[PDB]
Amino acid sequence: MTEYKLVVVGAGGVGKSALTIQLIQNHFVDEYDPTIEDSYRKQVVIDGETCLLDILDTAGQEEYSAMRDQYMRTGEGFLCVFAINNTKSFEDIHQYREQIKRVKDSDDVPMVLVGNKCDLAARTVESRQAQDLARSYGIPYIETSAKTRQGVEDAFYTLVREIRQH
Amino acid sequence: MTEYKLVVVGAGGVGKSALTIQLIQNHFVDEYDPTIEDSYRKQVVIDGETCLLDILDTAGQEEYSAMRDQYMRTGEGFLCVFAINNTKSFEDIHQYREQIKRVKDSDDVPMVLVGNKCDLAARTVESRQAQDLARSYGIPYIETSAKTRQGVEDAFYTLVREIRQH
Ligand SMILES: C[C@H](OP(=O)(O)OP(=O)(O)OP(=O)(O)OC[C@H]1O[C@@H](n2cnc3c(=O)[nH]c(N)nc32)[C@H](O)[C@@H]1O)c1ccccc1[N+](=O)[O-]
Ligand SMILES: C[C@H](OP(=O)(O)OP(=O)(O)OP(=O)(O)OC[C@H]1O[C@@H](n2cnc3c(=O)[nH]c(N)nc32)[C@H](O)[C@@H]1O)c1ccccc1[N+](=O)[O-]
Ligand SMILES: [Mg+2]
Ligand SMILES: [Mg+2]
């Protein structure tokens, strides 16, 4: 069948594992799983279309220098995730973009912006801010929460749609 | 606040009222409401952003000749809806596109493609077909059902996102 190599990218502790765990095994990872390279692949029906979502949850901290180069060349879609209480995670959602452009030899590659953790009162990255970066980037902006599942499907499915025009 | 004039467009009996009724008043309209010009407007939080969704559900049958011209000039986003069991509704999702381009003096205007009624066994418009029209159009493709609510939010929210880059 059709199938999709989505890489889930972003900083440490922003949520990208709780995102994926939400998508597949249907629960919140309050508890612990301090991980690096993780691969799940699912038989999924997106808009009447049968497809394999093959998703590479990645490691935050840069124990990961040129190893980012590998999978990034083998990623069709990229979910660039950050958190709304960690302004710094936002600031770094640019050098991820820049390294992807590097390895891809391309300046527009399927990508979605995800300001995660939105069920929190501890807001620091306003939407308005985040949104105009998506704008600067030409990539969508979808806010999310792995606590509430809120946003999680919109998030992954949008990216797929991005790949479809590419 | 920010606010969004979404027009919901498409053929007769494809579902565009059951779509909207699903979005707002939270139920399926099995029963009856054979309608023309209908306006609902909602205070909605889309991705941390407060906005007024002002949505014009429209009439199917062309009792509607130049009256389409009016609201179409006052529509930011357009949901172009059809049904998966009515190949003809598909075929006509082009002359809606063409009249919008007409009145807009524009060839790319925020728009989403919605092949509705997907909870049905009576399929006639395959995804593959529909999808490559979205492609031909550069507009997304989202399948939906007002029976199951399935797709309904993805549908409207995507379009908003389309308007945001425009
Ligand atoms: C960097 C390292 O792990 P990492 O893999 O580099 O970074 P992750 O994004 O994978 O971290 P993970 O998503 O597993 O943890 C997210 C943290 O926020 C919480 N969580 C996740 N997303 C949300 C959200 O949407 N809302 C709410 N309310 N809670 C959420 C989790 O309980 C967890 O403490 C890591 C760092 C810090 C904490 C965890 C952690 N980890 O490996 O689990
Ligand atoms: C043209 C005229 O009305 P119209 O306003 O021109 O066209 P509408 O799209 O508004 O028609 P509406 O959406 O109200 O009705 C949809 C029909 O399919 C059913 N329905 C809607 N969408 C779905 C879907 O996702 N799945 C399923 N299983 N059922 C759905 C409804 O019960 C209804 O019979 C009209 C024509 C035929 C029938 C109704 C009708 N109408 O005014 O209600
Ligand atoms: Mg992880
Ligand atoms: Mg109607």
Which resolution, in Å, applies to this structure?
A: 2.5
Name, in order, each residue with C-beta under 8 angstroms of B36's C-beta and a sequence gap of 6 or more: B58, B59, B63, B64
The 3-state secondary structure of chain B, one letter per residue = CEEEEEEEEECCCCCHHHHHHHHCCCCCCCCCCCCCCEEEEEEEEECCEEEEEEEEECCCCCCCCCHHHHHHHCCCEEEEEEECCCHHHHHHCCHHHHHHHHHHCCCCCCEEEEEECCCCCCCCCCHHHHHHHHHHHCCCEEECCCCCCCCHHHHHHHHHHHHHCC
- The reply to whether B14 sits in an annotated binding site is yes
Domain boundaries, chain A: 1-166
Shortest-distance ligand to the CA of residue B120: 2
For residue A112, the tally of other CB atoms under 10 A from its CB is 24
Structure tokens at B163: 């308007």
Q: How was this structure determined?
A: X-ray
A85 by Cβ neighbours in 10 Å (0-12 / 13-18 / 19+) ranks as middle
Q: Which of A7, A14, A82, A124 to mutate to test the pocket of ligand 1 (most atoms within 8 A of CB)?
A: A14
Q: Is A141's Cβ below 8 Å from some Cβ in B? A: yes
Q: Which helix (H) or strand (E) holds A135?
A: helix A127-137
Strand-pairing partners, residue A93, are none
**CATH 3.40.190.10 fits domain B1-166:** no
> Angle A18-A20-A26 (CA atoms, 0-180°, nearest 5)?
80
Residue ID of nearest Cα to ligand 2 atom 7 = B13
First to last CA, chain A: 17
Distance of CA A8 to the CA centre of its chain: 4
How far apart, in whole angstroms, are the C-alpha atoms of residue B29 and residue A65?
55
Distance A14 CA to ligand 1 centre (A): 6
Q: What is the DSSP secondary structure assignment for residue A93, as one 8-state letter?
A: T
Distance of CA B164 to the CA centre of its chain: 17
Residue with tokens 């790319």: B108
Q: Which helix (H) or strand (E) holds B80?
A: strand B77-83
